[PDB]
């Protein structure tokens, strides 16, 4: 559950990285002198690698979603266990109130 969702979070961050690499590459090209042309090539390869693996991750996840889609609303649930747990907790609360009353009558008896 955290796996595919964390993949989606990573692809969010890498879309940001793609835009920042676009911006950094045209930043270096706008310079009056741009000595680090090797670093320009590195930023260009970084940009294209970012776009390519963003495409790879999203295509893979659309494929995986195509494999496990059904168009049906999933008739499973967990309601009955929550109901039984609520009844158990209210049993405990009822016993707590009754124990408070018995202890209060014991304090009234011992108090005199």
């Amino acid at each position: 559950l955290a796996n595919e969702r964390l993949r989606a979070l990573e692809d969010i961050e890498r879309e940001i990285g793609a835009i920042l690499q676009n911006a950094g590459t045209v930043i270096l090209e706008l310079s009056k002198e741009k000595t680090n042309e090797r670093l320009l090539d590195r930023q260009a390869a970084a940009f294209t690698a970012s776009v390519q693996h963003v495409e790879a991750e999203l295509s893979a996840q659309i494929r995986y979603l195509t494999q496990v889609a059904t168009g049906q609303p999933h008739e499973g649930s967990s309601y009955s266990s929550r109901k039984d747990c609520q009844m158990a907790l209210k049993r405990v609360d009822y016993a707590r109130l009754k124990l408070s009353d018995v202890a209060r009558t014991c304090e009234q008896m011992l108090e005199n």
Partner: protein
């Protein structure tokens, strides 16, 4: 967005009288309201349509029944739309929960793949041949109202029995009377053990002990010496019974005391037949 008709808070209120995380809270409250409406729809339909002993009245949101003639039980769905017994409300929720889970049970699954479907013991009825009684016992849908009224009847009858025993322990001090309620109850059964001993002789006089089996409308008494007596739900019967047992104890004490002091028991009659006629039970005698 909750549906309207499900907002607010609702709860079933059951009474006996002698008279004529933000969204989590919202969704839990609305689901509870839905289940209370389900419960009361089941109860009111069973009250109106199913023919039962001492019929009920369903007015708008209130069911009134008279299980015992001095008793009035009231089940009311209190819908807030912004004396109470909790045990019957809790058992109402569990009864409708079991009634749901009967349909969604794993007992309907046929482990043999070829086998069609349906309950397991109804399949076992064929080869392991069942009589009429087992067949009808497997298929007997008793409504919620009969179950709740039987539980409330047992609660009231058991409280009356405890009250008569404690009133005899308070009023009468001449023999004594003790009680020991059991640890384990059902919803339709409890048990005591009633001793009747004299005050300073609890080793000598241990000859009258009872066991009462407080059912729904009957109290079944098993004596120490093999006498079984079924009383009724009135509280005069149990009072007269325990009064006669105190009277017989006052003679069995003297018999087992003359056993200790070496005296010779000439005659003993547990229910004597000469003399004035006693109103409650018979009279006993030794010499």
């Amino acid at each position: 967005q909750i549906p309207s008709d499900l907002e607010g808070s609702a709860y079933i209120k059951v009474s006996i009288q002698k008279q004529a995380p933000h969204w989590q809270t919202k969704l839990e409250a609305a689901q509870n309201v839905l289940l209370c409406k389900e419960i009361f729809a089941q109860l009111s339909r069973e009250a109106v349509q199913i023919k039962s002993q001492v019929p009920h009245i369903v007015v708008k949101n209130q069911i009134i029944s008279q299980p015992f003639p001095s008793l009035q039980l009231s089940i009311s769905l209190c819908h807030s739309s912004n004396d109470h017994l909790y045990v019957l409300e809790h058992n109402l929720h569990l009864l409708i929960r079991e009634f749901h889970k009967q349909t969604l049970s794993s007992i309907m699954m046929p482990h043999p793949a070829s086998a069609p479907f349906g309950h397991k013991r109804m399949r076992l009825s064929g080869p392991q041949a069942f009589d009429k009684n087992e067949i009808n016992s497997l298929q007997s849908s008793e409504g919620l109202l009969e179950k709740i009224i039987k539980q409330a009847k047992h609660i009231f009858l058991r409280s009356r029995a405890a009250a008569t025993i404690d009133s005899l322990a308070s009023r009468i001090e001449d023999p004594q009377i003790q009680a020991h309620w059991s640890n384990i109850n059902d919803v339709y059964e409890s048990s005591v053990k009633v001793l009747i001993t004299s005050q300073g002789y609890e080793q000598i006089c241990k000859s009258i002990q009872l066991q009462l089996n407080i059912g729904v409308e009957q109290i079944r008494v098993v004596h120490r010496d093999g006498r079984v007596i079924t009383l009724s739900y009135q509280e005069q019967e149990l009072q007269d019974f325990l009064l006669s047992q105190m009277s017989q104890h006052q003679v069995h004490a003297v018999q087992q005391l003359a056993k200790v002091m070496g005296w010779q028991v000439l005659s003993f009659s547990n229910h004597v037949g000469l003399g004035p006629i006693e109103s409650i039970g018979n009279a006993s005698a030794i010499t």
